[PDB]
Write a structure and sequence with these properties.
- With about 160 residues, this protein is mostly beta strands.
- The protein has one domain: Lipocalin (Beta Barrel), CATH 2.40.128.20.
- About 10% of the residues lie in helices and about 45% in strands.
- It contains one helix and ten strands; from the N terminus they run E-E-E-E-E-E-E-E-E-H-E.
- The chain has a ten-stranded antiparallel sheet, with helices on one face.
- The radius of gyration is 14 Å and the shape is globular.
- One of its GO terms (cellular component) is nucleus.
- InterPro entries: Calycin, Lipocalin, Lipocalin_CS, Lipocln_cytosolic_FA-bd_dom, Maj_urinary.
- Its main location: secreted.
């Protein structure tokens, strides 16, 4: 079964655990390029009562550094918010729990905004079919494929 965090049958506990950043996308490409603050390699999600603890690592000159964030449920079911390089809110428009998870995030900083979409997998890579389904979801949000970056060959330290 596949669900959306904003959907009725969403079971948040099933997204608990190991995850890896497979692809990142944004309508402001620089945010996810080599030294962008949003090029985050997810490692795990810990589901709590009213929040999610996210553990990522970033890379600089080939050196990895850890970083955690706490995303809190907002008043919309399926939506979370977190402060990180501005104010962010995000939902999970699609996940199948066992293989992939697709997130859509809105960042607001200095009075501006931008969209970020991420494809995460239980293993360090995903099938080309799942990657194509992710490209279609990006297109539904006005994000061009040239703004979609596959990081599956650079997500392990
Ligand atoms: C469950 C994780 C949602 C996506 C957060 C991505 C932030 C860095 O690109």
């Amino acid at each position: 079964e596949e669900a959306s965090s904003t959907g009725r049958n969403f079971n948040v506990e099933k997204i608990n655990g190991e995850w890896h950043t497979i692809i990142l996308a944004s309508d402001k490409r620089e945010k996810i390029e080599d030294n962008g603050n949003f090029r985050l390699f997810l490692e795990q999600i810990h589901v709590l009562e009213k929040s999610l603890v996210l553990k990522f690592h970033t890379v600089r000159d080939e050196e990895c550094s850890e970083l955690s964030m706490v995303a809190d449920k907002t008043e919309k079911a399926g939506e979370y918010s977190v402060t990180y390089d501005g104010f962010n809110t995000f939902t999970i428009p699609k996940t199948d729990y066992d293989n992939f998870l697709m997130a859509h995030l809105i960042n607001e900083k200095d009075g501006e905004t931008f969209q970020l979409m991420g494809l995460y997998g239980r293993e360090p890579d995903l099938s080309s079919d799942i990657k194509e389904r992710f490209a279609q979801l990006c297109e539904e949000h006005g994000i061009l494929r040239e703004n979609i970056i596959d990081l599956s060959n650079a997500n392990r330290c």
